[PDB]
Design a protein around this ligand. Sequence first.
Ligand SMILES: CC(C)c1onc(-c2c(Cl)cccc2Cl)c1COc1ccc(-c2ccc3c(C(=O)O)csc3c2)cc1
Lengths: 11, 229
Amino acid sequence: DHQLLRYLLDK
Amino acid sequence: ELTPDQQTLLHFIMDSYNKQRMPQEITNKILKEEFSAEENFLILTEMATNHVQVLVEFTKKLPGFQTLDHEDQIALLKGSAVEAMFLRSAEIFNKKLPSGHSDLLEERIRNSGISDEYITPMFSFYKSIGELKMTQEEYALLTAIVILSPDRQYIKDREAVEKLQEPLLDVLQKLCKIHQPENPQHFACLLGRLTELRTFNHHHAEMLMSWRVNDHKFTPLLCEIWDVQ
Ligand SMILES: CC(C)c1onc(-c2c(Cl)cccc2Cl)c1COc1ccc(-c2ccc3c(C(=O)O)csc3c2)cc1
């Protein structure tokens, strides 16, 4: 769940 | 006024807040594209979805944000993104930012499916906040403070957030004591907007509903940050 925010935070 | 850990805290923040993130190619569309209810809505959606990214980078560069729990990191972003957006658009209308294209951005918001119930308070807020004559510093620190609010729903470790918030609220007040001795009620005026921003957060869900039932798009990202089913 809530993957894009996760992705942006770790980029 | 001005301790060494505070003078350092600010210039790291005003560095992040000035990282010119919204590409001109995107923001120019406020100017050149046609003015219709549909096109106004797409452009606004495009601005917001790009800004959600600008905010996530900005929030990343906030001191100690990455030391927080991962479940708490999302909760803050989801709860504050709307309030961060009201603040940045406010800065656009107030300080007449050239990349904002103030008048035209206002025309698009005013004709994009939003009801009068929400438009009146919106620009009432914009009007009044601008009459404080906030400096860029005041805009940045409010954002960081809005993002680092522990009051949000679904937040687990609130004391850990309050620990990151406190230093900024302290810095902001010193700035008011320094640059504004003539009126010490200035700190409270700035903090007053946090509560005003909340009333809009609460209303914002209705705005999205109105759009959704009218087959309106949004983006995968906006839908994630705002729990659009
Ligand atoms: C359409 C939909 C997704 C929506 O729903 N509620 C709102 C909404 C509204 Cl209508 C009012 C207030 C807040 C929100 Cl979220 C919106 C549109 O939100 C915006 C988000 C972000 C910008 C925004 C940010 C930065 C900049 C910069 C810069 O950085 O240099 C230059 S141009 C610009 C534009 C504008 C509008």
